[PDB]
Design a protein around this ligand. Structure first.
Ligand SMILES: O=C(O)c1ccc(Nc2nc(-c3ccc4ccccc4c3)cs2)cc1O
Length: 327
């Protein structure tokens, strides 16, 4: 059947770790005082959670309270373990407390408050320099979680909280994050549709950290070309077609052939034949100031069908696109 695959970096981080690290089900969670937090306003409701702005009435600080839904309640030990494992890491959201909501009767995660700007409004204003700056900041967080044996699996603009006034960024929502174990087959029903990697779209389960790099490339393409989202699929099948109309069908077929993947036959009447498009097609007078040869070289090194061929987060940080960024 499918040819197996392994990450080319941090392959055996979890195979050496004591069971207690990646064995999240064993992990015992100590509940704090739900009463220490006063809910202020509902910020939004997701498929798996409800997010509230709240005040920690003991220190008067603003915090974010995420109340998990019944379906996401079952996978609380995994998210809590990952959050505790990455706490203090570069640009990782800090878990301040874990309390039992008295109404839902499900777990509520308390997080540090970030003065974010709506990504829809903020991507319309970023300069070339800020795009490079914030991308480098996101890479710090990805190399950190990947170095700790963790795949985020939901990298997208909504999960990157940016305080544009203090030039600070946090990678949030570790609800879909998972421990990387070499040879493990994972669920492909992860990430948001526009940021799903080709491995998920073609149902290749033996994926790794490189999935986050594809998601990151999708975000980069959206920022430099001022098209959000860059790959606008109508559904998960159309999503692959949108990608193929840009990257071409020959390289997609080469990728499926390399891993001996059987494409869903539904793709036969919708995929067609498409040559790879040169990036100049996406360049117009309104976005040319965000596009450079370094930006395109970097984007071409993230947006590859072959997950094994994508830059790793650490290699990405070495790219010339970041030479202008003050380090
Ligand atoms: O999961 C996490 O670690 C996590 C950490 C911090 C955090 N902060 C914040 N969230 C929001 C927010 C705004 C609009 C929304 C619309 C639909 C659904 C949700 C929404 C959440 C604003 S500031 C949120 C998180 O979910």
């Amino acid at each position: 059947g499918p040819v197996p695959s392994r990450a080319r970096v941090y392959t055996d981080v979890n195979t050496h770790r004591p069971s207690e690290y990646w064995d999240y089900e064993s992990h015992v969670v100590e509940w704090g005082n739900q009463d220490d937090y006063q809910l202020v306003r509902k910020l939004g409701r997701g498929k798996y959670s409800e997010v509230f702005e709240a005040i920690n009435i003991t220190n008067n600080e603003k915090v974010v309270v995420k109340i998990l839904k019944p379906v996401a309640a079952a996978k609380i030990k995994r998210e809590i373990k990952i959050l505790e494992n990455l706490r203090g890491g570069p640009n990782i959201i800090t878990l301040a407390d874990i309390v039992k909501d008295p109404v839902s009767r499900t777990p509520a995660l308390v997080f540090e408050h970030v003065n974010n700007t709506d990504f829809k409004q903020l991507y319309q204003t970023l300069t070339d320099y800020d795009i490079r700056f914030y991308m480098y900041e996101i890479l710090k967080a990805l190399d950190y979680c990947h170095s700790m044996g963790i795949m985020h699996r939901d990298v997208k603009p909504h999960n990157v909280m940016i305080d544009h006034e203090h030039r600070k960024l946090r990678l949030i929502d570790w609800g879909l994050a998972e421990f990387y174990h070499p040879g493990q087959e994972y669920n492909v029903r992860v990430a948001s549709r526009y940021f799903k990697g080709p491995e998920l779209l073609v149902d290749y389960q033996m994926y790794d950290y490189s999935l986050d790099m594809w998601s990151l490339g999708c975000m980069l393409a959206s920022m430099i070309f001022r098209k959000e989202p860059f790959f606008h699929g109508h559904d998960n099948y159309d999503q692959l077609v949108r990608i193929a109309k840009v990257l071409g069908t020959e390289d997609l077929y080469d990728y499926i052939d390399k891993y001996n993947i059987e494409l869903d036959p539904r793709f036969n009447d919708i995929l067609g034949r498409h040559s790879r498009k040169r990036w100049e097609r996406f360049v117009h007078s309104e976005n040319q100031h965000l596009v450079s040869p370094e930006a395109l070289d970097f984007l071409d090194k993230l947006l590859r069908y072959d997950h094994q061929s994508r830059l790793t987060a650490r290699e990405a940080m070495e790219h010339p696109y970041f030479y202008t960024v003050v380090k």
